[PDB]
């Protein structure tokens, strides 16, 4: 089977493109939108829409294989690749990559999408945006070929012999950490919230104050609302490193606050993300390390998930290797090739570190079907629902993904 | 090309079913729930998730056709089929449709929806939800058999010769009709806000005042947000049958009201939903057939849109007839088999009615897509950004698919 056209379009995504330095500046939010002058390159205004691109491999067949590449929502943000507008990028798909793609033989998955995640245009690399979408419809079009799910594919391919299941869905509030948690009950969401925690102050509370009654407010709030009596979700907090702040990064510290929120949790267990976010890499791969070890020494069963300071494939390696934490998130956009998606999944999964297929916002629906499949194929720990943060649009595209998915596997099971 | 498997998975929606029978008696609020006993048969909660059934059909040669059956928020409620729950009706598909479907060959698509359509079980026609997925998976089978789009088979089936072309697409704000606004403009929504102006006294004005500075507050904010100069949307506010209370179905009376906000809406173009609503079905036609002919013949180019009382595709005939307002509203869940909408739109088009292809916040990613397809094909005047209430998610789904079918039709052209 072979590739006979390549089309590309531009779109939408579930959210925006924020000019984060400018909004540090002093950016005015008014309404949905953000006042004043732009600071990053490419922008024309502080807050624009989120903006994909469709990227569609016609086969011989008359099937149509379909990606879509998208960045995060502070797309051209310090250490991300330039602001990923379609009109810019549409044309080095077009003459650059739509080019290697007419005529080739659709054979495995593995080395293609090597191939084009590796791909460099005037030696240097491709947007990571390109990247995600390529391989996204590659994969696609190696499941259509074969008649067979995206998630049988990458199983076939990555993680031979294994069982496609669901996996549990994770939702994100933002800053409405109380009515969006209504919606993820009544969702039936299997980790929640989020809750945004990301100013020490405000948010924790100094000493942690207000977290502890926001996770017993959780806690009542489920129980409150739950259609069915045996929905029991697991709590997963991101804390953007405050309790870090917090607690001067005293391990001891930190791990009997910690220890309280869990017993306030109770009955329900909890994951807190990024715990503490020091100075570079090594030190936060220590802390984590050295946090978990406390944990887990102390027998309190309470999880760190690891975020910043581990981006790239090898970041994951790293923090697996060291045990620094429990669960490490795999950034599916800023990774570019979804093969790399795969290869970061079976590597925590080798050597006993869970992990978190995640996201953006600011992806899309059929990126979130992609994404979903791979992280069902992998076995990860979770997968977060995405795009957007209307909070049902999201769960319902990769909920809905996932028992499809297991429906047709079912077929052949 | 034959049908050889037909699988159900019950799924999600972009929003809740609520019961609105128990809400009009005085359901209190409880953050995002509400509170009290629960009135109408099947609910067991006031406000429960939304459910949808994804029904795919496996053909002979592997590919998937994916239809997903769904219902309306108000779900049960008075005039509608039983709540739409896919524990109840999953069996049904399974046992009284699924073996009339397997082993079918796939020919045209609108003898095969037409069957589905008006198909009995046990005498009693079919829920119109089943018969929306069904009708949506049949579709997809055509379309996948013959290699094409699924605008392209409902043009052919439909609208034969005719060019298929992007089509305006509205976006619902529900009662954020300030932030959602914002939105709508950065998404460059063609059609906006809806607004929900469902109260006279807080919404509309005792004399229109409210709604009137409503509008004013609209243009001016898209005058202030656009990103580009020519972005000149359609305002489209749906107005409850508040202004025929405000005014006493006056005509006189509510072509003044409606022609002040013309002229406060310039330089944009209003269409105002539901500017009545009165006791019943004929009566609700002469009142929108005469404030239309006094409008026209003012010489007010301000356009009313059908809603309340026109159901039915014998209902939008009737509204057509009868020059019964300038659009009317296809409300696609509400009809069943996908095939009446085509009906529907291609009736409304060979009078000289606009053709308002609706939705609702409640169906799926996939219904849009659907739904979408349909719209275009029969060069509707608008279609609805859909599911969910966030926007962003909607706006996506419907313009990516329409882009992305208009790509591909291309290379047919
Ligand atoms: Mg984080
Ligand atoms: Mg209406």
Chains 1, 2 share one sequence.
């Not at 669901?166 to 980790?191: C, L, T």
Request: glycine content about 10%; hydrophobic content about 40%; aromatic content about 6%.
């Amino acid at each position: 089977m072979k590739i006979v056209d390549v089309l590309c379009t531009p779109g939408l995504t579930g959210f925006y493109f924020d000019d984060q330095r400018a909004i540090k500046k002093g950016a005015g939010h008014d309404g949905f939108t953000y006042t004043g002058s732009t600071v990053t390159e490419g922008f024309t205004q502080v807050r624009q829409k989120g903006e994909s691109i469709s990227v569609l491999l016609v086969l011989e067949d008359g099937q149509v294989a379909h990606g879509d590449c998208a960045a995060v929502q502070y797309s051209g943000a310090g250490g991300r690749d330039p602001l990923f507008l379609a009109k810019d990028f549409i044309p080095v798909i077009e003459k650059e990559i739509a080019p290697k793609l007419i005529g080739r033989e659709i054979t495995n998955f593995k080395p293609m999408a090597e191939e084009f995640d590796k791909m460099t245009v005037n030696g240097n690399r491709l947007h990571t945006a390109i990247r995600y979408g390529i391989t996204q419809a590659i994969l696609d079009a190696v499941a259509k070929t074969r008649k067979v799910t995206m998630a049988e594919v990458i199983r076939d391919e990555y993680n031979p012999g294994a069982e496609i299941n669901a996996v549990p869905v994770f939702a994100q509030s933002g800053d409405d950490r109380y009515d969006n948690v209504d919606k993820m009950i009544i969702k039936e969401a299997d980790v929640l919230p989020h809750a945004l925690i990301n100013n020490v102050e405000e948010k924790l509370g100094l000493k942690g104050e207000k977290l502890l009654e926001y996770v017993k407010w959780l806690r009542d709030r489920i129980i409150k609302l739950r259609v069915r009596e045996d929905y029991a979700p697991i709590f997963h907090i991101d804390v953007y490193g405050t309790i870090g702040a917090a607690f001067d990064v005293d391990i001891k510290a930190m791990a009997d606050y910690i220890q309280t929120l869990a017993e306030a949790a109770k009955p329900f267990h909890l994951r807190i993300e990024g715990p503490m976010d020091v100075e570079d890499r090594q030190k936060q791969m220590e802390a984590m390390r050295d946090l978990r070890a406390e944990l887990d020494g102390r027998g309190v069963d309470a999880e760190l998930v690891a975020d910043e300071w581990c981006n790239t494939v090898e970041d994951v390696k790293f923090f697996t290797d060291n045990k620094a934490g429990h669960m490490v998130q795999i950034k599916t956009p800023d990774l570019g090739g979804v093969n790399n998606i795969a290869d970061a999944i079976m590597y925590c999964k080798a050597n006993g570190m869970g992990a978190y297929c995640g996201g953006t916002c600011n992806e899309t629906n059929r990126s979130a079907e992609v994404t979903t499949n791979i992280g069902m194929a992998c076995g990860a720990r979770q997968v977060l629902a995405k795009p957007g943060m209307g909070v049902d649009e999201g769960m319902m595209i990769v909920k809905n993904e996932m028992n499809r998915v297991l429906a047709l596997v079912g077929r052949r099971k």
